[PDB]
Amino acid sequence: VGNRYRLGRKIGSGSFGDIYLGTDIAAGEEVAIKLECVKTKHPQLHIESKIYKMMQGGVGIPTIRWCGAEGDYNVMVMELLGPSLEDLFNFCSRKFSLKTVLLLADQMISRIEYIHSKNFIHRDVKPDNFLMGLGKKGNLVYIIDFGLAKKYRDARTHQHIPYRENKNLTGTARYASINTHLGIEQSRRDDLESLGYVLMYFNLGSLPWQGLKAATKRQKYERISEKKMSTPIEVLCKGYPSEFATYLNFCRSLRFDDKPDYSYLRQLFRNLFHRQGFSYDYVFDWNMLK
Amino acid sequence: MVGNRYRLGRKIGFGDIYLGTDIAAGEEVAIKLECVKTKHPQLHIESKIYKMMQGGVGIPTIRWCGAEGDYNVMVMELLGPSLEDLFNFCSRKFSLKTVLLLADQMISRIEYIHSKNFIHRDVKPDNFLMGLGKKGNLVYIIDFGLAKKYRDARTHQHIPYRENKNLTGTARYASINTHLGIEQSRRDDLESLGYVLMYFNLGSLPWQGLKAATKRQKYERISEKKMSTPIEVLCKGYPSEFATYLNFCRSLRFDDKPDYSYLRQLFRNLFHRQGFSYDYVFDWNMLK
Numbered sequence: 001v002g003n004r005y006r007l008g009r010k011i012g013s014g015s016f017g018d019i020y021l022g023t024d025i026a027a028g029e030e031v032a033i034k035l036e037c038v039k040t041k042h043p044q045l046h047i048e049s050k051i052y053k054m055m056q057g058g059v060g061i062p063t064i065r066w067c068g069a070e071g072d073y074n075v076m077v078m079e080l081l082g083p084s085l086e087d088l089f090n091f092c093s094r095k096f097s098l099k100t101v102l103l104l105a106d107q108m109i110s111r112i113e114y115i116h117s118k119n120f121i122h123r124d125v126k127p128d129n130f131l132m133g134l135g136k137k138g139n140l141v142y143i144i145d146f147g148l149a150k151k152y153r154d155a156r157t158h159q160h161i162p163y164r165e166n167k168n169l170t171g172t173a174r175y176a177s178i179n180t181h182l183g184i185e186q187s188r189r190d191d192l193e194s195l196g197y198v199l200m201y202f203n204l205g206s207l208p209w210q211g212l213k214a215a216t217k218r219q220k221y222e223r224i225s226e227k228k229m230s231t232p233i234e235v236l237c238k239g240y241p242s243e244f245a246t247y248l249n250f251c252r253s254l255r256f257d258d259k260p261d262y263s264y265l266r267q268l269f270r271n272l273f274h275r276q277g278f279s280y281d282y283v284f285d286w287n288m289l290k
Numbered sequence: 291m292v293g294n295r296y297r298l299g300r301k302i303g304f305g306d307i308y309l310g311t312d313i314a315a316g317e318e319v320a321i322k323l324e325c326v327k328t329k330h331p332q333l334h335i336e337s338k339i340y341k342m343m344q345g346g347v348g349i350p351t352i353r354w355c356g357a358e359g360d361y362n363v364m365v366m367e368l369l370g371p372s373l374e375d376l377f378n379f380c381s382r383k384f385s386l387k388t389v390l391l392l393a394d395q396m397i398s399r400i401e402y403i404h405s406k407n408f409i410h411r412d413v414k415p416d417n418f419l420m421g422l423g424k425k426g427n428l429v430y431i432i433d434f435g436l437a438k439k440y441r442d443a444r445t446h447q448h449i450p451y452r453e454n455k456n457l458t459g460t461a462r463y464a465s466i467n468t469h470l471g472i473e474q475s476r477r478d479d480l481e482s483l484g485y486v487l488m489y490f491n492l493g494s495l496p497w498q499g500l501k502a503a504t505k506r507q508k509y510e511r512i513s514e515k516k517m518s519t520p521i522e523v524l525c526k527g528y529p530s531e532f533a534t535y536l537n538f539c540r541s542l543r544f545d546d547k548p549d550y551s552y553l554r555q556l557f558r559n560l561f562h563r564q565g566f567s568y569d570y571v572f573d574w575n576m577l578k
């Protein structure tokens with residue numbers, strides 16, 4: 001955009017707009033650029049940039065270099081990050097070692113806790129929304145995409161949003177909490193339950209509610225909801241360390257406005273990591289690729 | 291380039307060049323692919339020249355990967371745009387300050403290659419790249435595909451004078467002796483740089499856009515125009531240092547060692563007299 005940014009390859013899309021790799025010619029830096037049509041009915045890129053700015057300084061929160069307008073677009077320039085966890089799962093033949101799953105789990109719980117500490121819920125916890133850093137930040141898991149994020153409490157009083165029903169499923173149905181499928185207003189517990197499904201997806205290679213055929217989105221979400229509700233946690237997690245089922249049961253037991261015990265959840269996986277005798281070196285499956 | 295470690299991205303350019311990602315190291319890189327069954331293999335030969343030059347200021351770091359399927363693969367660290375790309379981004383006009391900042395590094399890059407016993411033989415704006423990030427003020431040199439050893443590493447015995455040589459390289463920037471079929475030596479790399487500097491000053495050289503019946507005839511028309519344009523006419527209206535630089539290069543004997551410091555001093559003194567500051571703010575750093 002303008003005379004400064006050269007747009008490269010389109011690297012897909014997030015919530016509302018296309019994302020490209022690019023070059024900031026003036027600063028001499030490779031970056032990533034998100035474009036929103038300036039005349040869009042529901043503008044949110046500037047709202048999203050202010051969420052990233054409010055979250056700035058938090059571990060694994062990407063830096064926004066610039067957010068403004070150029071031609072027919074609202075533009076947000078982000079620092080260049082590495083592949084998403086879904087990309088890395090594909091590069092690793094859709095199989096992660098237990099050690100890589102546990103290393104990711106620790107950081108993913110912390111990123112969600114941080115967002116919650118800043119009064120927001122993410123509402124779209126999925127592998128594609130966690131990116132590894134590049135270079136010296138290659139061991140750091142970042143969280144992206146605040147397009148569906150919502151404030152769950154007043155920053156001043158900490159008064160929680162009220163319980164609501166008949167809500168539409170926004171987010172990715174594969175990883176949605178059961179309460180989300182049932183139309184309940186999302187809260188802190190839902191971000192963590194979704195992470196529990198992401199962890200089991202990394203363990204299994206797929207979830208048992210994937211690949212269900214449907215003619216419409218509405219039908220597909222119903223089939224996923226029914227399968228997800230009718231699969232006991234102890235069946236879903238069969239043949240994997242008990243910590244994955246304990247984690248999911250804990251999240252599903254939380255009241256709508258409960259504060260999650262994030263340290264208890266990290267400790268489940270940290271204790272398992274120690275019992276397995278794994279080294280604390282941050283060597284992930286993809287670091288072994290030749 | 292693949293295997294399981296490198297993901298190929300967009301093609302950016304002896305073979306094709308792609309942006310890519312080293313998944314294992316977590317680094318964005320560039321990857322060059324040469325067909326394994328090519329008639330004239332040169333990628334492995336080029337990789338050894340880069341490795342021998344390693345550690346020199348502005349020499350890119352590489353990794354020879356060998357044969358991966360149907361390709362020979364070479365991975366290079368990720369660099370920024372070439373000077374031709376930046377010239378285009380700057381509307382094919384560079385300020386005198388940007389030309390002088392570039393000249394100092396370009397003379398030193400050629401001197402380094404010469405100190406490592408090679409001549410480059412394809413000095414052109416596309417073969418100089420700026421670095422990215424903390425290396426954004428550094429000019430790198432690339433492409434050793436036409437490079438040749440001009441002297442023995444130990445004895446410094448120079449290669450002999452030869453005639454009837456073919457013009458390899460870019461005709462626009464070739465030295466007059468290159469057009470005349472004379473064996474290239476150190477002087478030729480520096481004369482080519484002199485034309486690159488005047489190309490940045492002018493926006494074009496007076497031997498550009500010449501029409502001809504064949505490429506052979508076009509190269510002859512470029513040669514005729516370069517020989518028929520006195521240095522003082524080519525450089526008219528620009529600081530005398532550009533003409534002094536070109537006259538010096540054209541005065542060198544075939545095996546003479548160039549006085550690189552004399553040439554850098556011409557432009558360093560001019561930069562000081564012009565009252566420019568070493569803030570390293572190039573024309574492209576002002577783009578909005």
Ligand SMILES: CC(C)(C)NC(=O)N1CCn2nc(-c3ccc(F)c(Cl)c3)c(C(N)=O)c2C1
Nearest residue numbers: 032033034076078079080081082083084144311
């Ligand atoms: C450098 C390679 C090609 C490995 N990186 C990626 O594949 N990416 C994953 C997908 N992805 N998505 C983003 C991204 C996410 C959200 C954004 F708003 C913006 Cl501007 C960029 C970014 C980023 N900041 O570099 C990336 C980076």
Ligand SMILES: CC(C)(C)NC(=O)N1CCn2nc(-c3ccc(F)c(Cl)c3)c(C(N)=O)c2C1
Nearest residue numbers: 023320321322364366367368369370371372432
């Ligand atoms: C990051 C952006 C896209 C701005 N870079 C470029 O436009 N490039 C200029 C063109 N260019 N050419 C190369 C290059 C030259 C020679 C090589 F053998 C290899 Cl593998 C790469 C490279 C490199 N090492 O990054 C580049 C880099």
